[PDB]
Nucleic acid binder design. Structure first.
Lengths: 215, 222
RNA sequence: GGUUGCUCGACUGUGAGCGGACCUACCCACUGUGGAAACACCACAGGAACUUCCAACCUUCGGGUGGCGAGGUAGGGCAGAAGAGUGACC
């Protein structure tokens, strides 16, 4: 049978300098054969603890493993903002090896309202018959935000796609990019395109907008 | 130090097809260490795949690849391979190579990792991105960027001004168009005054299609 | 013929609590640690404990020394000896 590594929580928001505890509970005895890894977006994982308590070479003292039978805990005494990452427990006591499902850690800062822009579709695109309207929400926190496209004061539904940046670890903030997309035809039926942001840092829902054809 | 691991052989592959990921070791010899492949489907977690043990060549496999994958090492080439046959959609992942550390130093941890090669198992054919420019507003800072639209497969890369302009840049993660393709957009904020005099070119590279685009981003023409 | 000593000896034995520790070579194993080493390979330490034993050595004859994988094969050690001699004695 396979040893299961069942690691909780799935995700963790914490203030700078808090204590954070991640725990992993091996479905069988895995002796002390448990290693903890930090992985930041786009990077390979880096080793932190290896014998369930042994701080690898160069990992800062604010990390430490601790075993209690089949229960393994990685412990940050006081978060730094760099400590944004997804942490995985691994058992290498038996084959096949096994990883935790991972825990995502977020920085926590003061609120930052989003700087808001709106982009009307390029000319090269409108020749190719496509028409994307882009709305940016820059350098804000917490990631909680609501964007709403209104075309000619009509709220849109289902033709917008957004994506969010990870937390800029120095900044501790987020950026968002909502993209309404329309055929050239649907775009040429309206004048006013508008992006309605609702955020905790804004006391009133900011709207950036443009009219079709204003130079 | 010099301890380095460099994967390759990853890419787009039709369902059912084959691939042979490699891993060059640099700052150590692999004959004295255990070598492991770990994979990660997009936005999912780490998943152990295989490993080969020093001095014996003994091979161990994740159950989900047992009999479709084969891990093996060439000592002369200081290289480790992974033949993957009969690939399916769910093998789609970054495939990482890993050195199991020297026991006296790091237990059974994995103390050095490659940057991972990306394997993309679908049948839908490659296509390069049309790159369109996000002109800044005509009105003390405003923001400008590039809209990289309808490409496949991941990844693209956006730099600005041949990588000279690195500050303030947000290149958003691709989202999947219902069209099946990838779109994403990169932006950067600049103080307003540089507009007239500062050339703003984003460099968009999409290696799968052999597509490099450079798009100059100038202000509103009127 | 008896009694036995003496020498050759077929063969068998090496006996486990109310009671088994002989040696050597190879093989086959088990456990730990170490070898850049999760299995494989190698080296090395070690076979629950309390006992029991001296096939081994030394002895001032009081005692001491050294010694355990109930594995396989085998060459011997030590114990009986079927039998062959062969004496003293009746």
């Amino acid at each position: 049978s396979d040893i299961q590594m069942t690691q909780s929580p799935s995700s963790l928001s914490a203030s700078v300098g808090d204590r954070v505890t991640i725990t992993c509970r091996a479905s069988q005895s895995v002796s002390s054969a448990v290693a903890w890894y930090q992985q930041k977006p786009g990077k390979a994982p880096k080793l932190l603890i290896y014998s369930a308590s042994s701080l690898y070479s160069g990992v800062p003292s604010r990390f430490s493993g601790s075993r209690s039978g089949t229960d393994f805990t990685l412990t940050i005494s006081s978060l730094q903002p760099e400590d944004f990452a997804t942490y995985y427990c691994q058992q290498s006591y038996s084959f096949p090896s096994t990883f935790g499902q991972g825990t995502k850690v977020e920085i926590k800062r003061t609120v930052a309202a989003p700087s808001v822009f709106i982009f009307p579709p390029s000319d090269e695109q409108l020749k190719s018959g496509t028409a994307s309207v882009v709305c940016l929400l820059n350098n804000f926190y917490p990631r909680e935000a609501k964007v709403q496209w209104k075309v000619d004061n009509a709220l849109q539904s289902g033709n917008s796609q957004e994506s969010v940046t990870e937390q800029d670890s120095k900044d501790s903030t987020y950026s968002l990019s909502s993209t309404l997309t329309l055929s050239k035809a649907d775009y040429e039926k309206h004048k006013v395109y508008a992006c309605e942001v609702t955020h905790q840092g804004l006391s009133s829902p900011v709207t950036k907008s443009f009219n079709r054809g204003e130079c | 130090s010099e301890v380095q691991l460099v994967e390759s052989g990853g890419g787009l592959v039709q369902p059912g097809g084959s691939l042979r990921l490699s891993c060059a070791a640099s700052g150590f010899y692999i004959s004295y260490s255990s070598i492991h492949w770990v994979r990660q489907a997009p936005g999912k977690g780490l998943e152990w795949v295989a490993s080969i043990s020093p001095y014996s060549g003994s091979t161990y496999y994740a159950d989900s690849v047992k009999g479709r994958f084969t891990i093996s090492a060439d000592t002369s080439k200081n290289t480790a391979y992974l033949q993957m046959n009969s690939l399916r959609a769910e093998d789609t992942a970054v495939y990482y190579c890993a050195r199991q550390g020297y026991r006296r130093r790091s237990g059974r941890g994995f103390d050095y990792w490659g940057q991972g090669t990306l394997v993309t198992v679908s049948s839908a054919s490659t296509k390069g991105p049309s790159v369109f420019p996000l002109a800044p507003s005509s009105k003390g800072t405003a923001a400008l960027g590039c809209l990289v639209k309808d490409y496949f497969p991941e990844p693209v890369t956006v730099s600005w001004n041949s990588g000279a302009l690195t500050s303030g840049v947000h290149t958003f993660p691709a989202v999947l168009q219902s069209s099946g393709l990838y779109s994403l957009s990169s932006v950067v904020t600049v103080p307003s005054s540089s507009l007239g005099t500062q050339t703003y070119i984003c460099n968009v590279n999409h290696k799968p299609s052999n597509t490099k685009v450079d798009k100059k981003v100038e202000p509103k023409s009127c």
